[PDB]
A paper describes a structure:
Transcriptional regulator [name] inhibits the expression of the multidrug efflux pump operon mtrCDE in the pathogenic bacterium [name]. Here, we show that binding of human steroidal hormones results in a comformational change in the [name] structure rendering it incompatible with DNA binding, thus revealing the structural mechanism of [name] induction.
In addition to these three gonadal steroids, we also tested the binding of ethinyl estradiol (NDR), which is a synthetic estrogen used in some hormonal contraceptives, and found that it binds [name] with a Kd of 0.94 ± 0.6 µM. Residue D171 on helix α6 appears particularly important for binding and ligand specificity because its carboxy side chain was positioned within proximity to the hydroxy groups on the five-membered ring of TES, EST and NDR. The center-to-center distance between the “recognition” helices of the HTH motifs in the DNA bound structure is 36.8 Å. This distance is increased to 45.0, 45.2, 45.6, and 45.2 Å for [name] bound to PTR, TES, EST, and NDR, respectively.
Numbering used by the authors:
A (entry chain D): 10 to 73, 82 to 209
B (entry chain C): 10 to 75, 82 to 210
Write the structure that this text describes.
Amino acid sequence: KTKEHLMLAALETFYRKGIARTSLNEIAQAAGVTRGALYWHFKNKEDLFDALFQRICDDIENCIGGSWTVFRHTLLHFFERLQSNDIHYKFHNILFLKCEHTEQNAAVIAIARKHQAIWREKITAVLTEAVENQDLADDLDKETAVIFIKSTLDGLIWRWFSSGESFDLGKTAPRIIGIMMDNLENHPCLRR
Amino acid sequence: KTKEHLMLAALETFYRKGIARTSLNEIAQAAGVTRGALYWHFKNKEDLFDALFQRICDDIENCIAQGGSWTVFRHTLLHFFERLQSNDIHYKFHNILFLKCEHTEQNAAVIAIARKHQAIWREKITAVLTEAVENQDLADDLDKETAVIFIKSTLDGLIWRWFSSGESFDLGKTAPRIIGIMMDNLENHPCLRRK
Ligand SMILES: C#C[C@]1(O)CC[C@H]2[C@@H]3CCc4cc(O)ccc4[C@H]3CC[C@@]21C
Ligand SMILES: C#C[C@]1(O)CC[C@H]2[C@@H]3CCc4cc(O)ccc4[C@H]3CC[C@@]21C
C-alpha cells in the first residue's frame, strides 16, 4: 500500500545521508506525508529499517535442474540484482557502508543481525539438502561451511562497495562463486 | 613522546565513538595536550588517521621473520589474523576501519586516506604475486589482477564477517583453514588463469 511509498523514502534517505544521521521527520518529508501520518505505519527508524530488510529477503525467496544446481542460480541471480535492481543496490550499500556500529545505531544493528542470522539458518538447510542429495560430501563440515560462504560472498560485496565499484562485478562474481562452489564440493579444509 | 600519546587517544575515541562524531578537540582532552600541542603534531583528523594507518602497516611490515617466498606470505597472513586477536591496537583499528567509518560526506575527508593505504596493499599484493610466478610457485598465466581482488575479498570478507558478527566464531581456527583454501586456490585453480 502507501506503506511501500513511505519505505522507498526511508530507503532513499538512508542512502543519501546514512542511518544514524537520518530522522523520521526527514523521511516523512521524502514521501510527503505528515510525521503523525507515518507514525501510524512505523513508529521509528528501526521499524522502517526492519520493513526494508524484509522486502529484500522476499525478493530473493521469490526468485527461485537439481536443487543444488538451482542454488548457484539463485546466488548468481543475487549478484546481478545487486547491479541492475535499484533497491538491492541501494539497500546493501546502506547495509554495508552507512550502518556504523555506534550507539546512535545500536538498535538498528540488532535488527540487521537478526536477518543475517535467518540467512545463516537458511544457508545450513541448503547444504543439508545437498549432502543427502549426493551433490556434496557425506563428511562436509557445516559450521565452517557457513563462515566460508558468508566470508567469501559478503567479502566480495564489501570489497566492491568500499572500493567505489572499482571492478566489473558481473564478470568477477560468477568466477568467485564458481571457485567457491568447486571448493564446497572438493576441498577438505571443509571436512569434519 | 606526546606524539604517541595523542595517537592512542585518537584510537580509543575513534573506537568508542566512530570516526565522524570525533572532533580534533576530543582527541586532545583525552590525550592530556591542548589544541596547540595537538595542532603542532597534526594538521587535522585525516592525518592523525593517516598516522595510525601507517603505524599498523609499520607494525605489519616490521615483523618479517623466517623456507621460500610464497612460503612467507602464508606466514605474515597467519601472523596478521593472530595480531587481530592478541594485539589491542590492531584489533581496535580494523574494528574502526571495518565498522565505525561510515561512507558519508564528512568522513569523506578520511576515506581517501583509507583508500590510499588500501591501494598500497593492492600493489604489495600484486608484488608478492609477481615474485611467486617468477619463483615458479604460481603459474605463469595467473591472471594476477583477479588474484588481487580474490585475495582481499576473501580476507577482508573473513575480517568483516568476524567483526560484524560480534566475533561469533574462532578466528584462530577459521583463518588458517580459510587462508589454506585460498592459497591452494591461487596455486591450482583454473578460473584464475587468463586464456
Ligand atoms: C546476505 C548475504 C550473503 O552473505 C551475501 C549473498 C547472500 C546469499 C544470496 C542468495 C542466497 C540464496 C540462498 O538459497 C540462500 C541464501 C542466500 C543469500 C544469503 C547469504 C549471502 C551469501
Ligand atoms: C588490511 C587488509 C587485507 O585486506 C586483509 C589482510 C591483508 C594482508 C595482510 C598481510 C599482507 C602481506 C603482504 O606481503 C602484502 C599484503 C598484506 C595485506 C594485504 C591486504 C589484506 C589482504
